[PDB]
Design a protein around this motif. Structure first.
Motif, PDB file in Angstrom:
ATOM      1  N   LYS A  26       0.842  -1.200   0.000  1.00 26.08           N
ATOM      2  CA  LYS A  26       0.000   0.000   0.000  1.00 26.08           C
ATOM      3  C   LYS A  26       0.891   1.270   0.000  1.00 26.08           C
ATOM      4  O   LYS A  26       1.692   1.489   0.907  1.00 26.08           O
ATOM      5  CB  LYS A  26      -1.038  -0.044   1.154  1.00 26.08           C
ATOM      6  N   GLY A  27       0.793   2.079  -1.050  1.00 22.63           N
ATOM      7  CA  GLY A  27       1.601   3.295  -1.137  1.00 22.63           C
ATOM      8  C   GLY A  27       0.848   4.499  -1.646  1.00 22.63           C
ATOM      9  O   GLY A  27      -0.167   4.339  -2.321  1.00 22.63           O
ATOM     10  N   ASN A  28       1.326   5.698  -1.297  1.00 19.41           N
ATOM     11  CA  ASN A  28       0.854   6.933  -1.953  1.00 19.41           C
ATOM     12  C   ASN A  28       1.901   7.580  -2.860  1.00 19.41           C
ATOM     13  O   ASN A  28       2.861   6.935  -3.285  1.00 19.41           O
ATOM     14  CB  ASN A  28       0.273   7.953  -0.957  1.00 19.41           C
ATOM     15  CG  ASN A  28       1.226   8.296   0.156  1.00 19.41           C
ATOM     16  OD1 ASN A  28       2.431   8.057   0.058  1.00 19.41           O
ATOM     17  ND2 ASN A  28       0.690   8.863   1.232  1.00 19.41           N
ATOM     18  N   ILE A  52       1.188  12.933 -11.667  1.00 23.91           N
ATOM     19  CA  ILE A  52       1.819  12.417 -10.501  1.00 23.91           C
ATOM     20  C   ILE A  52       3.246  12.211 -10.876  1.00 23.91           C
ATOM     21  O   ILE A  52       3.514  11.525 -11.876  1.00 23.91           O
ATOM     22  CB  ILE A  52       1.220  11.066 -10.131  1.00 23.91           C
ATOM     23  CG1 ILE A  52      -0.265  11.226  -9.830  1.00 23.91           C
ATOM     24  CG2 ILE A  52       1.921  10.520  -8.906  1.00 23.91           C
ATOM     25  CD1 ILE A  52      -1.040   9.967 -10.097  1.00 23.91           C
ATOM     26  N   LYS A  53       4.141  12.788 -10.065  1.00 27.01           N
ATOM     27  CA  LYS A  53       5.596  12.592 -10.203  1.00 27.01           C
ATOM     28  C   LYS A  53       5.938  11.238  -9.616  1.00 27.01           C
ATOM     29  O   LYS A  53       5.822  11.044  -8.396  1.00 27.01           O
ATOM     30  CB  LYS A  53       6.406  13.695  -9.484  1.00 27.01           C
ATOM     31  CG  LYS A  53       5.998  15.118  -9.848  1.00 27.01           C
ATOM     32  CD  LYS A  53       7.148  16.116  -9.802  1.00 27.01           C
ATOM     33  CE  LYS A  53       6.982  17.194 -10.872  1.00 27.01           C
ATOM     34  NZ  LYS A  53       6.991  16.589 -12.240  1.00 27.01           N
ATOM     35  N   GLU A 164      -8.257  10.056  -2.506  1.00 26.23           N
ATOM     36  CA  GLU A 164      -9.083  10.847  -1.572  1.00 26.23           C
ATOM     37  C   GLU A 164      -8.787  12.344  -1.735  1.00 26.23           C
ATOM     38  O   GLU A 164      -7.638  12.727  -1.703  1.00 26.23           O
ATOM     39  CB  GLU A 164      -8.820  10.395  -0.133  1.00 26.23           C
ATOM     40  CG  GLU A 164     -10.006  10.540   0.813  1.00 26.23           C
ATOM     41  CD  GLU A 164     -11.170   9.630   0.451  1.00 26.23           C
ATOM     42  OE1 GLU A 164     -10.990   8.389   0.400  1.00 26.23           O
ATOM     43  OE2 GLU A 164     -12.274  10.160   0.217  1.00 26.23           O
ATOM     44  N   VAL A 165      -9.804  13.185  -1.914  1.00 28.52           N
ATOM     45  CA  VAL A 165      -9.612  14.630  -2.204  1.00 28.52           C
ATOM     46  C   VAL A 165     -10.464  15.505  -1.272  1.00 28.52           C
ATOM     47  O   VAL A 165     -11.669  15.254  -1.136  1.00 28.52           O
ATOM     48  CB  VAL A 165      -9.985  14.983  -3.691  1.00 28.52           C
ATOM     49  CG1 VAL A 165      -9.914  16.472  -3.981  1.00 28.52           C
ATOM     50  CG2 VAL A 165      -9.083  14.279  -4.674  1.00 28.52           C
TER      51      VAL A 165
ATOM     52  N   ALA B   9      -2.782  18.635   2.078  1.00 29.04           N
ATOM     53  CA  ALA B   9      -2.749  18.111   3.452  1.00 29.04           C
ATOM     54  C   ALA B   9      -3.813  17.048   3.773  1.00 29.04           C
ATOM     55  O   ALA B   9      -3.577  16.169   4.599  1.00 29.04           O
ATOM     56  CB  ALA B   9      -2.835  19.256   4.441  1.00 29.04           C
ATOM     57  N   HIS B  10      -4.984  17.149   3.144  1.00 29.56           N
ATOM     58  CA  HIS B  10      -6.053  16.144   3.294  1.00 29.56           C
ATOM     59  C   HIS B  10      -6.463  15.564   1.925  1.00 29.56           C
ATOM     60  O   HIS B  10      -7.651  15.383   1.628  1.00 29.56           O
ATOM     61  CB  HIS B  10      -7.269  16.729   4.030  1.00 29.56           C
ATOM     62  CG  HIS B  10      -6.931  17.465   5.287  1.00 29.56           C
ATOM     63  ND1 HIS B  10      -6.658  18.818   5.306  1.00 29.56           N
ATOM     64  CD2 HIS B  10      -6.840  17.044   6.571  1.00 29.56           C
ATOM     65  CE1 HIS B  10      -6.413  19.200   6.547  1.00 29.56           C
ATOM     66  NE2 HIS B  10      -6.517  18.142   7.333  1.00 29.56           N
ATOM     67  N   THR B  11      -5.459  15.304   1.092  1.00 32.94           N
ATOM     68  CA  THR B  11      -5.607  14.608  -0.195  1.00 32.94           C
ATOM     69  C   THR B  11      -4.558  13.487  -0.250  1.00 32.94           C
ATOM     70  O   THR B  11      -3.417  13.663   0.203  1.00 32.94           O
ATOM     71  CB  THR B  11      -5.538  15.584  -1.415  1.00 32.94           C
ATOM     72  OG1 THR B  11      -6.761  16.318  -1.517  1.00 32.94           O
ATOM     73  CG2 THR B  11      -5.339  14.874  -2.738  1.00 32.94           C
ATOM     74  N   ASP B  12      -4.975  12.334  -0.771  1.00 36.30           N
ATOM     75  CA  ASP B  12      -4.129  11.161  -0.878  1.00 36.30           C
ATOM     76  C   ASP B  12      -4.327  10.411  -2.163  1.00 36.30           C
ATOM     77  O   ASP B  12      -5.444   9.979  -2.477  1.00 36.30           O
ATOM     78  CB  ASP B  12      -4.388  10.225   0.287  1.00 36.30           C
ATOM     79  CG  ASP B  12      -3.551  10.558   1.475  1.00 36.30           C
ATOM     80  OD1 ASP B  12      -2.337  10.846   1.289  1.00 36.30           O
ATOM     81  OD2 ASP B  12      -4.113  10.527   2.590  1.00 36.30           O
ATOM     82  N   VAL B  13      -3.229  10.239  -2.887  1.00 43.06           N
ATOM     83  CA  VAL B  13      -3.249   9.501  -4.135  1.00 43.06           C
ATOM     84  C   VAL B  13      -2.676   8.120  -3.853  1.00 43.06           C
ATOM     85  O   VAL B  13      -1.461   7.948  -3.852  1.00 43.06           O
ATOM     86  CB  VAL B  13      -2.480  10.281  -5.219  1.00 43.06           C
ATOM     87  CG1 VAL B  13      -2.504   9.571  -6.566  1.00 43.06           C
ATOM     88  CG2 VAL B  13      -3.066  11.678  -5.355  1.00 43.06           C
ATOM     89  N   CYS B  14      -3.558   7.147  -3.597  1.00 43.84           N
ATOM     90  CA  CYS B  14      -3.179   5.827  -3.059  1.00 43.84           C
ATOM     91  C   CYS B  14      -3.403   4.606  -3.964  1.00 43.84           C
ATOM     92  O   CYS B  14      -4.268   4.609  -4.846  1.00 43.84           O
ATOM     93  CB  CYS B  14      -3.909   5.597  -1.738  1.00 43.84           C
ATOM     94  SG  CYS B  14      -3.287   6.549  -0.339  1.00 43.84           S
ATOM     95  N   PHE B  15      -2.636   3.551  -3.713  1.00 43.98           N
ATOM     96  CA  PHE B  15      -2.795   2.275  -4.416  1.00 43.98           C
ATOM     97  C   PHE B  15      -2.545   1.107  -3.467  1.00 43.98           C
ATOM     98  O   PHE B  15      -1.846   1.259  -2.476  1.00 43.98           O
ATOM     99  CB  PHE B  15      -1.880   2.206  -5.639  1.00 43.98           C
ATOM    100  CG  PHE B  15      -0.418   2.259  -5.302  1.00 43.98           C
ATOM    101  CD1 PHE B  15       0.230   3.479  -5.115  1.00 43.98           C
ATOM    102  CD2 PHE B  15       0.324   1.087  -5.160  1.00 43.98           C
ATOM    103  CE1 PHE B  15       1.582   3.531  -4.778  1.00 43.98           C
ATOM    104  CE2 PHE B  15       1.672   1.135  -4.836  1.00 43.98           C
ATOM    105  CZ  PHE B  15       2.299   2.356  -4.641  1.00 43.98           C
ATOM    106  N   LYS B  16      -3.161  -0.036  -3.766  1.00 46.89           N
ATOM    107  CA  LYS B  16      -2.941  -1.313  -3.076  1.00 46.89           C
ATOM    108  C   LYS B  16      -2.651  -2.321  -4.157  1.00 46.89           C
ATOM    109  O   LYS B  16      -3.350  -2.377  -5.199  1.00 46.89           O
ATOM    110  CB  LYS B  16      -4.189  -1.799  -2.345  1.00 46.89           C
ATOM    111  CG  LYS B  16      -4.327  -1.386  -0.893  1.00 46.89           C
ATOM    112  CD  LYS B  16      -5.563  -2.042  -0.260  1.00 46.89           C
ATOM    113  CE  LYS B  16      -6.323  -1.064   0.645  1.00 46.89           C
ATOM    114  NZ  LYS B  16      -7.313  -1.714   1.549  1.00 46.89           N
TER     115      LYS B  16
END
Lengths: 171, 171, 171, 171
Positions: A26-28, A52-53, A164-165, B9-16
């Motif tokens: 699991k990563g961001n 996304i960089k 999540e935004v 600060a309350h945004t997350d670009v995530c993957f699993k």
């Protein structure tokens, strides 16, 4: 012969056996930017463009992150960023819709569907607009000829995306 | 529409993503006993009989140890101990030999070969004899119809046995 | 000593090595029934209720089908059928919608989303109505505590459902 | 709405699920040569030197054989042959012994133990000597840094060697 009695203190009756365990990596990403056009009157997205960089990946382990940048994964020398471009938002209701867009990973592009869930269009304390929302979807490594050297056995073909935004109005 | 700017600060670009990892389960047994007949003049074993109380297993994790005792593994209610009985020691040299014996795990018996490595036949400080030696070998779960419900994929068919012994003369 | 020359005709230089291969198990069911209410004027489903006799499974291999019926899978003695019950159809457009319903497998029930793709609402040669359409979706074995003895490693947690339908008007 | 009845002939209730299967890859080599010195009076090997042309591999599938020659396996351009050189034969009895030797695969060398089983030292019809015998042993891919790109998960670390020999006296 002669008889002996074990010394239990420096005797060990041992075994080794090999087993598999599945786990979620699991990563961001720490560094990305986006362009967000959204009409609260009709709860419809108008434009959504993300970049996304790849460099900024974080899977809670710095040595794996480096490895991600290498040729058998990202190739972040040659392809420093991955991009998403909205092509269509099909509304389900005021909380839900189906976003279709172009994702590019390391130079390869496929159209994907994300599931939009609008989590509250408020007007924040200062009188200026905010929105919360999530984007969810599954992409297949094989669709993007990604990490092609790594088998679908060791590492899953499926990647799950959760975006999540929270977001504030411009100017 | 309206334009928004992400709040980072309350945004997350995530993957699993799901991957496999192989690992050795390594355990001993705290309670066992043996009968050891050995002739230092000819460096030959004469009798070697071991009994291991399955109950006393230790794979450095108490919750897995319990699980080991259950029906899909040891069945330590019905079969409280596993046993090894030497049938033949074929000498290679004074440091090395090939031990053949009967191993029984949960009521099933097969003949196995262990590799004996004699690690120093001394006469300890008190004037009484000591010996050190190791027994090594691979057994196959399938030979003992062991853990038959668990696939050879999740858990290896091969179990590696390392027995380390120091031992003192009797009476 | 003495020297020898191989006879190549009855000499073999051999090896065995163990590898994994992933593959799709793909099966249908020969016996099921459904109730289909659909309004071509608005391209919306009104009622969709399916019952599938577990007994009638077919994964192109009769010996595995039998195994499917056993306790570590279907339990078709105790639970002879699996059922799907539409609770909501949310239209996307005239070709597309998001069906939510209750799926029950071996006594356990979860709400699932299928993706409806309407493949042509015609009026067949005889003057009576026909429709074609597909339902697609992924369910997780773990959501239905299904085959719980079999690991998510050997067999995937994910099951992909494709339902293909042609269908004719009633009476 | 309107009611429909399935046409069972062009309706399919389908599923796909992904599972793993383990299997032995079993292959020989069509072209190799050896030097065999053996003393039937004492049933002891004196010299055993084998060279196997990697090019000549056969795992009953011509497209995999080609793949074996590539950089992620054999590198048969750079390293056309693999070699075994006996360094020691330690007799167990007249039927059995422990052969230690140097194996080289793609430029890397390790000492291995093979298990010699002498299968009948006869004097063939023509009055000239024959011997039958087998060599068996397990080597670890990792010991020879072999196929290092392929995980110990997809393909086993262990390779099992069975060499079967009939052989006739020289001149």
């Amino acid at each position: 012969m002669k008889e002996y009695t074990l010394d239990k203190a420096h005797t060990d009756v041992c075994f080794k056996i090999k087993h598999l365990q599945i786990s979620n990596v699991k990563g961001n990403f720490k560094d990305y930017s986006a362009v967000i056009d959204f009409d609260p009157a009709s709860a419809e997205f108008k434009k959504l463009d993300v970049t996304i960089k790849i460099a900024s990946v974080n899977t809670e382990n710095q040595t794996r992150d480096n490895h991600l940048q290498q040729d058998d994964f990202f190739k972040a020398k040659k392809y420093p960023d991955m991009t998403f471009t909205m092509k269509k938002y099909e509304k389900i209701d005021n909380e839900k819709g189906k976003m279709t867009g172009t994702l590019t990973i390391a130079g390869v592009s496929k159209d994907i569907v994300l599931d939009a869930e609008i989590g509250g269009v408020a007007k924040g304390k200062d009188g200026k607009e905010k929105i919360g929302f999530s984007l969810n979807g599954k992409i297949k490594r094989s669709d993007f000829k990604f990490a092609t050297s790594t088998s679908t056995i060791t590492l899953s073909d499926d990647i799950n995306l959760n975006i999540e935004v929270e977001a504030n109005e411009k100017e």
